[model samples]
Target: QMTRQARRLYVGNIPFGITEEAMMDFFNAQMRLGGLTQAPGNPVLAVQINQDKNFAFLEFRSVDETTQAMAFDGIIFQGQSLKIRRPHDYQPSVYVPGVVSTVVPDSAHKLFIGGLPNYLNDDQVKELLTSFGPLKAFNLVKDSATGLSKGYAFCEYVDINVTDQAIAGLNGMQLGDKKLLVQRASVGAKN
Candidate 1:
């Protein structure tokens, strides 16, 4: 839905310690163009931090907002001078659903978080992972049609500090009557 009149922005220089809800809570309250309401929707999903800890991509709500929000560049959000611009063509906001990749940034660095009740969802896994760093996206192995958990999941940390904390404090940690398998998730040759 993008055209030459508008372009999507990749929000850089975000604070490392906020959740997606917090991110939405902040952006949804900001000034905007006359088209859309400030309702919560998917904005950022795939997040990969660096060794330097200085940047991130806040993929816009749509191609339209991506263009609109750019005018507010110097505008403040969470105390940082929120940077905005279009990202590299290769950089994407979300991967296709049902697609799995073994060669991602967190290829070798993954954690198996278990012990969650069957009711747990991808967002909860992200909430737990937020204490470490901005998560990319949660891929829950599920019962496809019924849309239920198979009793385990993977949480990925884009930043090292967050990844370290999750592995150290939550590995073998108890949750909902189960001790989680907290370790680097294997990049399966089959998945």
Candidate 2:
């Protein structure tokens, strides 16, 4: 089981030469000004900077606080607009089976793509899928509570016939630590 303290956020567009102590202080005050109360102590637990990448990972005291910190996205920090995002491995809870609800209707053209890495945002996923063909519709399921990606998605290509080709080319392709599961959404369905 993932601990609540495992909630980490990827912070980008950080100004060069900023220190970890300054970042921690900045976020701690921002959280309070933004109306977030800490459990007892400081909410910003730690900050790890990647000087070369101009990014940093900010660890929070809990999942809820980390999720709320996402609001700081685009907040001006040191004259730069900081981009706040969830780190790749930041899963608030363990994966539970059979919890996803379908957003798109089942059809020959609809594809069910499972095993997606949580780090991939909508634009990245859309770019990968559209390499096969333009999508008529796409939906990446997200946790309603925390707004984190559920790591599975549904989509349909604009051209119905491209569905088979997409499934053939994408299925079993290893992305990050998981193999893509691309298939028709209607498979094994009664209706």
Candidate 3:
């Protein structure tokens, strides 16, 4: 029973006039559809709804479980397709003018994997990288509308040695008819 950071799930394109309870029920139903079931009480830790934005933030119990649920993104819910993603993945389309952006590198434990073939999915990426070690976190960027891979992903290894090995073995290696760009994720702060 390992504990991790509270995972925030960003739900977008929400239909207006939906209640928090209704949304939770929708999530529960989807979880069940995916062979996931809550023990007893509410599975949703907390929810913040943004009616004007047509979105909501649903905090889940664990990052692992939440990540697993992300597989259900783009499912038809309330007669509308649902878009799910981590809070970090969402960026406002409009940016403050003259503000330079920066990539804040987190740690060597995490690796940036790019140049993924559009057809490749998250599980395939896992298969390609698992030889090095177990991953702590894994995410493949994708189009929210279609749930199609965006040709890149990020994964963190539990062991630094394994992370190093993954970088050595997979960096520049071809997978899914494309060369992989495996490297320490570029992370920095805007000055």
Candidate with maximal TM-score = 3
Off by over 4 Å in 3: 1-105, 187-191
Model 2, runs deviating above 4 Å: 1-6, 92-191
Cα error, residue 188 of model 1, in Å, equals 7.9
Backbone Cα, N, C clashes tallied per candidate: 3, 0, 6
Quick one: RMSD of model 2?
Answer: 12.8
RMSD of each: 13.1, 12.8, 11.9
Q: Estimate, for each residue in 103-163, the C-alpha lDDT of model 2 and write its tens digit.
A: 3567767888989999776556766888888766666666544445689888887799989
Best model number under lDDT: 2
| TM-score of candidate 2 relative to the true fold | 0.46
> Weakest 10 consecutive residues, lDDT, candidate 2?
93-102
Error of 2 at 160 (Å): 32
Candidate 2, clashing residue pairs? none
lDDT of each: 0.53, 0.73, 0.64
lDDT of 3 by residue, 20-120 (tens): 87887778665655456446544567678887666888877765556665665545454444567667753322222211111213665667888889876
Cand. 1 TM to true fold: 0.44
